[PDB]
């Protein structure tokens, strides 16, 4: 438990062993569980010394200790990571990636992961210094199972951080370079490696449809669905995020998701006790019901409409908003037969009960869905019966109240509904 003053005294000595002991003391100080004195270490001007120690091939222990200390400094605020980067640490860590000592290369991997995880600027800077090639060289083995577990986990997490963040998204050539190894890792058995690989894929699929296409071309969707059917929440969460991102794309990518059998997992997802899982799954379903009519039909065949009715009847309010969106997309793109099936499953009463919420957007979505169902009934001539249903569940009173809403669109649409049908 040295003081920063003693650490500085030792590091400023012309004795490599005293410097090593002071650097180890700094590492232990920065590795304590409560409030590491990162700012105090920075103010003492110690980062340049640690960076210089990173290059002492003659003394591997001081390399390791300084790498650990700099890793922990770079794990803090953006200003602290920036202090690490300004010391010239990026190229030193990249040079250490090829060290013959596995623990030192692993520490360099960790440090680069923190730096890249700061944000898109430092991510792209790490990429410009040439980290991807040595990082992937570390994983160029016939069987990943021969690598140490922690080493593989750290490599996967750092790679995921290189795939992370937008504005801008990672360089396309870098994504193309990394994706094959990402597929390999996505077929690994370790739960943490799988979780971090799924997170990386979720990052890569979060953007324009061209990036989604880069990912889907690798054939990972079946594996993503298999992982979606996993037991570990830390794996299901990123897998579900990636699947949702993918189905935000073209009808062909959504169809790739459907063909892999994803819908068969949604009975559980739409009833998952974790609210975030339910919300993400309902959002995915809403984007799926915004697709082609055969895709809505596949949603119907898997028996998911009753699950949407359930989520609409009882769930977190945000999940209910996602379900209202799903219903509006369904009724906007669906055939008259599918809309009638939706009505037969009991959508009217929950959709009308949700009109009492103090949220304008869900109100407008629900009114659009009601208009679509009424158009279907008109096409069938059952508008009268549907109005009877809406009146029995107390919904006519809700639309009558919406008449006097503080939003133009809401009042206008409620008026149109009551005058064109009621």
């Amino acid at each position: 438990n040295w003081s920063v003053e003693d650490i500085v005294k030792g590091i400023n000595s012309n004795n490599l062993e005293s410097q090593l002991q002071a650097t180890q003391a700094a590492r232990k100080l920065l590795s304590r569980e409560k409030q590491p004195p990162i700012d105090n270490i920075i103010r003492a001007g110690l980062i340049p010394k640690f960076v210089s120690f990173l290059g002492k091939t003659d003394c591997s222990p001081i390399q390791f200790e300084s790498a650990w200390a700099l890793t922990n400094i770079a794990s803090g605020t953006s200003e602290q990571t920036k202090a690490v980067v300004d010391g010239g640490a990026i190229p030193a860590f990249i040079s250490l990636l090829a060290s013959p000592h596995a623990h030192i290369s692993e520490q360099a991997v960790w440090a680069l992961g923190n730096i890249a995880g700061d944000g898109s600027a430092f991510r792209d800077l790490v990429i410009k210094h040439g980290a991807i090639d040595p990082l992937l060289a570390l994983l160029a083995v016939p069987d990943l199972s021969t690598l140490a577990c922690g080493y593989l986990r750290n490599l996967t997490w750092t790679l995921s951080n290189l795939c992370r963040n937008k504005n801008p998204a990672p360089p396309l050539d870098a994504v193309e370079q990394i994706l094959p190894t990402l597929v390999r890792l996505l077929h690994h058995n370790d739960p943490e490696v799988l979780a971090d690989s799924c997170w990386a894929i979720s990052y890569l699929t979060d953007g324009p449809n061209e990036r989604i296409e880069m990912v889907v071309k690798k054939g990972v969707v079946p594996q993503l669905v298999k992982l979606l059917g996993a037991t570990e929440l830390p794996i299901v969460t990123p897998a579900l995020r990636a699947i949702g991102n993918i189905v935000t794309g073209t009808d062909e990518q959504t169809q790739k998701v459907i063909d892999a059998g994803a819908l068969a997992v949604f009975p559980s997802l739409l009833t998952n006790p974790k609210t975030n899982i339910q919300k993400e799954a309902t959002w995915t379903m809403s984007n799926i019901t915004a697709g082609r009519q055969d895709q809505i039909q596949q949603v119907v065949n898997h028996g998911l409409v009753p699950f949407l009715v359930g989520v609409l009847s009882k769930a977190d309010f945000k999940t209910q908003k996602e379900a209202a969106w799903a219903i509006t997309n369904y009724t906007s793109g669906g055939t008259v037969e599918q809309i009638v099936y939706l009505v037969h499953c009991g959508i009217i009463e929950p959709l009308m009960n949700l009109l009492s919420a103090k949220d304008t957007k869900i109100i407008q979505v629900i009114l659009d869905a009601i208009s679509n169902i009424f158009q279907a009934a008109e096409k069938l001539g059952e508008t009268e019966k549907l109005s009877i249903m809406i009146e029995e569940c107390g919904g006519l009173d809700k639309i009558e109240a919406l008449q006097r809403h503080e939003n133009e669109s809401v009042y206008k649409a409620s008026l149109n509904l009551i005058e064109k049908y009621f």
């Binding site: 590491p36 650990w68 890793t71 520490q107 960790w110 995880g117 951080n161 935000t248 984007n287």
Partner: peptide, 12 residues
Amino acid sequence: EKRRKFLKRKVW
């Protein structure tokens, strides 16, 4: 993310 070493709607 950062780690310390111890010891269609595109948006929802």
